[PDB]
Short mmCIF file of C-alpha atoms in Angstrom, two decimals:
data_model
loop_
_atom_site.label_atom_id
_atom_site.label_comp_id
_atom_site.label_asym_id
_atom_site.label_seq_id
_atom_site.Cartn_x
_atom_site.Cartn_y
_atom_site.Cartn_z
CA UNK A 265 73.67 119.98 127.01
CA UNK A 266 73.10 119.35 130.87
CA UNK A 267 74.90 122.43 131.79
CA UNK A 268 72.06 124.53 129.93
CA UNK A 269 69.36 122.35 131.55
CA UNK A 270 70.72 123.19 135.14
CA UNK A 271 70.70 127.44 134.71
CA UNK A 272 67.12 126.76 132.62
CA UNK A 273 65.86 124.70 135.50
CA UNK A 274 67.53 128.00 138.03
CA UNK A 275 66.51 130.87 134.84
CA UNK A 276 63.30 130.06 134.36
CA UNK A 277 61.61 127.25 137.10
CA UNK A 278 62.46 129.20 140.10
CA UNK A 279 60.99 133.01 139.12
CA UNK A 280 58.30 130.94 137.44
CA UNK A 281 56.72 129.69 140.71
CA UNK A 282 58.55 133.10 142.30
CA UNK A 283 56.02 134.88 140.14
CA UNK A 284 52.96 132.02 141.06
CA UNK A 285 53.15 132.23 144.73
CA UNK A 286 53.51 135.61 144.89
CA UNK A 287 51.36 137.02 142.22
CA UNK A 288 48.87 134.20 144.76
CA UNK A 289 50.38 136.21 148.28
CA UNK A 290 49.38 139.76 146.75
CA UNK A 291 52.44 141.36 147.74
CA UNK A 292 52.76 145.06 148.80
CA UNK A 293 51.08 145.35 152.86
CA UNK A 294 51.07 149.18 154.01
CA UNK A 295 50.73 149.86 158.11
CA UNK A 296 54.62 148.18 157.64
CA UNK A 297 56.91 145.11 155.96
CA UNK A 298 56.45 142.63 153.47
CA UNK A 299 58.20 140.35 155.76
CA UNK A 300 58.49 137.12 153.00
CA UNK A 301 57.94 140.07 150.64
CA UNK A 302 61.90 141.03 151.55
CA UNK A 303 62.75 137.36 152.00
CA UNK A 304 62.14 136.31 147.88
CA UNK A 305 64.15 137.05 145.33
CA UNK A 306 68.04 135.64 145.94
CA UNK A 307 70.40 134.68 143.41
CA UNK A 308 71.16 130.89 142.53
CA UNK A 309 74.75 130.30 141.46
CA UNK A 310 73.50 130.99 138.03
CA UNK A 311 70.90 133.92 137.24
CA UNK A 312 72.77 134.53 134.68
CA UNK A 313 75.41 133.97 132.00
CA UNK A 314 77.45 131.38 132.69
CA UNK A 315 80.15 132.11 129.63
CA UNK A 316 83.47 130.89 130.85
CA UNK A 317 82.44 127.17 130.35
CA UNK A 318 79.68 127.73 127.71
CA UNK A 319 81.93 129.83 125.25
CA UNK A 320 84.81 127.29 125.89
CA UNK A 321 82.64 124.51 124.66
CA UNK A 322 81.64 126.01 121.39
CA UNK A 323 85.16 127.00 120.62
CA UNK A 324 85.67 122.86 121.19
CA UNK A 325 82.29 122.21 119.62
CA UNK A 326 83.94 124.32 116.47
CA UNK A 327 86.82 122.04 116.62
CA UNK A 328 85.19 119.20 116.46
CA UNK A 329 83.43 120.34 112.87
CA UNK A 330 86.24 121.30 111.45
CA UNK A 331 86.49 117.64 112.18
CA UNK A 332 83.87 116.28 110.69
CA UNK A 333 85.05 119.01 108.13
CA UNK A 334 88.43 117.13 107.79
CA UNK A 335 86.62 113.36 107.37
CA UNK A 336 84.30 114.48 105.31
CA UNK A 337 86.49 115.73 102.58
CA UNK A 338 88.72 112.67 102.56
CA UNK A 339 85.37 110.55 101.91
CA UNK A 340 84.62 113.26 99.57
CA UNK A 341 88.07 112.79 97.02
CA UNK A 342 88.22 108.52 98.67
CA UNK A 343 84.86 107.76 97.51
CA UNK A 344 85.53 109.15 93.81
CA UNK A 345 88.86 107.30 93.63
CA UNK A 346 86.97 104.21 94.56
CA UNK A 347 84.37 104.68 91.55
CA UNK A 348 87.26 106.14 88.93
CA UNK A 349 89.55 103.21 88.84
CA UNK A 350 87.03 100.91 88.64
CA UNK A 351 84.71 101.03 85.95
CA UNK A 352 87.63 100.99 82.59
CA UNK B 188 127.04 91.35 83.34
CA UNK B 189 128.14 88.46 81.37
CA UNK B 190 123.98 88.06 80.20
CA UNK B 191 125.02 92.06 79.85
CA UNK B 192 128.97 92.21 77.67
CA UNK B 193 132.99 91.01 78.27
CA UNK B 194 132.63 87.46 78.12
CA UNK B 195 131.30 86.63 75.05
CA UNK B 196 134.21 85.27 74.08
CA UNK B 197 131.75 82.56 73.83
CA UNK B 198 133.83 79.58 75.11
CA UNK B 199 133.84 81.95 78.20
CA UNK B 200 130.10 83.11 77.20
CA UNK B 201 129.56 78.47 77.81
CA UNK B 202 130.88 77.66 81.28
CA UNK B 203 128.44 79.61 82.44
CA UNK B 204 125.69 78.74 80.06
CA UNK B 205 126.23 75.37 81.20
CA UNK B 206 126.68 76.82 84.91
CA UNK B 207 123.18 78.92 84.28
CA UNK B 208 120.55 75.66 83.61
CA UNK B 209 122.47 74.17 86.92
CA UNK B 210 121.98 77.30 89.02
CA UNK B 211 117.95 77.52 87.80
CA UNK B 212 117.67 73.97 88.81
CA UNK B 213 120.77 74.66 92.55
CA UNK B 214 117.04 77.09 93.82
CA UNK B 215 114.04 75.91 93.51
CA UNK B 216 112.83 79.53 93.70
CA UNK B 217 114.29 80.38 90.16
CA UNK B 218 111.05 79.68 88.66
CA UNK B 219 112.19 77.16 85.15
CA UNK B 220 113.46 79.97 82.05
CA UNK B 221 111.85 82.89 83.37
CA UNK B 222 115.03 84.45 84.67
CA UNK B 223 116.28 83.69 81.25
CA UNK B 224 113.36 84.62 79.19
CA UNK B 225 113.35 87.97 81.71
CA UNK B 226 115.25 90.05 79.59
CA UNK B 227 119.57 89.44 77.86
CA UNK B 228 119.83 86.25 78.28
CA UNK B 229 117.72 84.24 76.64
CA UNK B 230 117.95 86.94 73.87
CA UNK B 231 122.05 86.24 74.12
CA UNK B 232 122.94 82.57 74.40
CA UNK B 233 122.15 80.06 72.23
CA UNK B 234 118.80 77.36 72.21
CA UNK B 235 119.65 74.42 70.99
CA UNK B 236 124.22 74.54 70.14
CA UNK B 237 126.01 73.24 72.40
CA UNK B 238 123.68 74.57 75.72
CA UNK B 239 120.82 72.62 75.32
CA UNK B 240 119.12 75.19 76.85
CA UNK B 241 115.29 75.32 74.62
CA UNK B 242 115.23 71.04 76.05
CA UNK B 243 115.01 73.14 79.85
CA UNK B 244 112.34 74.96 78.09
CA UNK B 245 110.62 72.07 75.27
CA UNK B 246 110.08 70.79 79.14
CA UNK B 247 108.59 72.98 81.10
CA UNK B 248 106.21 73.07 78.85
CA UNK B 249 105.61 69.61 78.50
CA UNK B 250 104.58 69.94 82.27
CA UNK B 251 105.85 66.32 82.85
CA UNK B 252 107.80 63.84 84.90
CA UNK B 253 108.30 61.68 80.90
CA UNK B 254 109.55 65.11 79.74
CA UNK B 255 112.06 65.62 82.34
CA UNK B 256 112.48 61.93 82.46
CA UNK B 257 113.26 61.97 78.19
CA UNK B 258 115.81 65.16 78.82
CA UNK B 259 117.73 65.11 81.52
CA UNK B 260 121.22 64.30 82.08
CA UNK B 261 123.82 62.76 84.04
CA UNK B 262 125.06 65.19 86.28
CA UNK B 263 122.08 66.56 87.54
CA UNK B 264 120.35 63.21 88.24
CA UNK B 265 123.20 60.73 90.31
CA UNK B 266 122.67 64.12 92.71
CA UNK B 267 119.88 64.68 92.22
CA UNK B 268 116.66 66.85 90.27
CA UNK B 269 114.13 64.42 91.52
CA UNK B 270 112.82 66.32 94.24
CA UNK B 271 112.62 69.34 92.50
CA UNK B 272 111.17 68.09 89.44
CA UNK B 273 107.78 67.69 91.58
CA UNK B 274 108.30 71.11 92.73
CA UNK B 275 108.78 72.47 88.66
CA UNK B 276 105.19 70.64 88.27
CA UNK B 277 103.73 72.01 91.39
CA UNK B 278 104.64 75.98 90.13
CA UNK B 279 103.66 75.08 86.20
CA UNK B 280 100.66 73.68 86.24
CA UNK B 281 98.52 75.72 88.77
CA UNK B 282 99.73 78.40 87.03
CA UNK B 283 98.75 76.86 83.45
CA UNK B 284 95.62 75.84 83.57
CA UNK B 285 94.52 79.41 85.56
CA UNK B 286 96.78 81.46 82.48
CA UNK B 287 94.25 79.71 79.70
CA UNK B 288 90.70 78.73 81.31
CA UNK B 289 90.63 81.31 81.96
CA UNK B 290 91.84 82.39 85.39
CA UNK B 291 88.83 80.64 87.73
CA UNK B 292 90.04 76.95 87.66
CA UNK B 293 87.46 74.18 89.28
CA UNK B 294 88.67 72.12 92.53
CA UNK B 295 88.14 68.82 90.15
CA UNK B 296 90.41 69.47 86.99
CA UNK B 297 93.14 70.89 89.29
CA UNK B 298 93.76 67.63 90.57
CA UNK B 299 93.32 65.81 87.25
CA UNK B 300 96.48 68.36 86.17
CA UNK B 301 98.25 67.68 89.68
CA UNK B 302 97.26 64.15 89.49
CA UNK B 303 97.10 63.88 93.74
CA UNK B 304 94.30 64.02 95.82
CA UNK B 305 91.61 66.80 96.70
CA UNK B 306 93.22 67.41 100.34
CA UNK B 307 96.80 67.98 98.30
CA UNK B 308 95.38 70.38 95.88
CA UNK B 309 94.72 72.29 98.69
CA UNK B 310 97.43 71.66 100.16
CA UNK B 311 100.52 72.85 96.77
CA UNK B 312 97.06 75.58 96.59
CA UNK B 313 98.81 76.75 100.58
CA UNK B 314 102.45 76.83 99.73
CA UNK B 315 101.52 78.56 96.19
CA UNK B 316 99.82 81.33 98.14
CA UNK B 317 102.98 81.78 100.19
CA UNK B 318 104.85 82.05 97.37
CA UNK B 319 102.52 84.19 96.01
CA UNK B 320 101.68 82.72 92.61
CA UNK B 321 98.47 83.19 93.47
CA UNK B 322 97.13 85.72 95.40
CA UNK B 323 93.23 85.57 97.06
CA UNK B 324 91.36 83.70 99.58
CA UNK B 325 90.60 79.77 98.19
CA UNK B 326 86.84 79.09 97.93
CA UNK B 327 86.20 75.40 98.20
CA UNK B 328 85.13 73.88 94.59
CA UNK B 329 85.39 77.33 91.81
CA UNK B 330 87.17 79.80 92.05
CA UNK B 331 90.00 77.73 93.41
CA UNK B 332 93.29 79.64 92.81
CA UNK B 333 92.83 83.69 91.02
CA UNK B 334 95.17 86.20 90.35
CA UNK B 335 98.73 87.18 90.84
CA UNK B 336 99.69 86.22 87.68
CA UNK B 337 104.01 86.66 88.50
CA UNK B 338 105.70 83.95 86.21
CA UNK B 339 106.70 84.02 82.55
CA UNK B 340 104.24 84.06 79.43
CA UNK B 341 106.89 85.54 77.01
CA UNK B 342 103.89 87.46 74.04
CA UNK B 343 100.98 86.42 76.31
CA UNK B 344 101.94 88.62 79.05
CA UNK B 345 103.38 91.69 76.30
CA UNK B 346 100.00 91.46 74.65
CA UNK B 347 98.15 91.82 78.28
CA UNK B 348 100.52 94.43 78.04
CA UNK B 349 99.63 96.46 75.13
CA UNK B 350 95.98 96.12 75.99
CA UNK B 351 96.89 97.49 78.76
CA UNK B 352 98.64 100.26 77.77
CA UNK B 353 95.03 101.25 75.58
CA UNK B 354 92.85 101.00 78.94
CA UNK B 355 95.96 102.22 80.91
CA UNK B 356 95.47 105.22 78.79
CA UNK B 357 92.30 105.59 78.53
CA UNK B 358 91.37 105.79 81.80
CA UNK B 359 93.66 107.75 83.10
CA UNK B 360 93.35 111.03 80.78
CA UNK B 361 89.38 110.64 81.64
CA UNK B 362 90.08 110.04 85.37
CA UNK B 363 92.28 113.27 85.28
CA UNK B 364 89.81 115.43 83.29
CA UNK B 365 87.34 114.93 86.00
CA UNK B 366 89.44 115.24 88.48
CA UNK B 367 90.43 118.80 86.69
CA UNK B 368 86.62 120.50 87.55
CA UNK B 369 87.63 119.12 91.36
CA UNK B 370 90.60 120.74 91.35
#
């Protein structure tokens, strides 16, 4: 959740303000550059796709869901056995 | 082995049968008649004829120093059986009340049955719990001693088994039917 929020604040939040500013500047200079237009947009460390953390995350959450499933399966049959022995 | 086969040869059986009564009184872990009842020995040795075997079984049921004082004999009371009678009284009455009442006896009754104080009854209850003749948490004044039921009860444990068989047969088949729709 902190890893996703860090990439989102770089992907969306930086780019949104850069377009906000670039639209205020208006964005093409005809006799010579374009100095601050040339300065604008250079990649932050995540521009997209931190998959090495994400995929390894998902394999671990899948392992966690398997542990939830096995714990639930133990609980289903323990509840059944506890109810079954008492009532006769 | 003696109670099974060989030394029957009743003269050899008599001398160890008299020793078996002494062996029962010798270790206060040996209950009273329970070991003899449990398998072949009581179904192999005469009750009144020479052995004096059923006399111990009568003293156990009629539950008192007066019954031992009537029925005791020189060899065991010389050493003697004074302490062991109180240990016997503690096990037999605590089982018998709970077994009959039926199963959650009052403190006030138990003081009258054991013939001792309230705190003395609680002390008797601790080592009844350590013995595991009774076995769950003890409440203050009612619900005093419950479960285990380890002691002899002859037909009152045989009839309980016949009732339990009926219960087991209904429960195991019905629960097998439910778990055979869920496996």
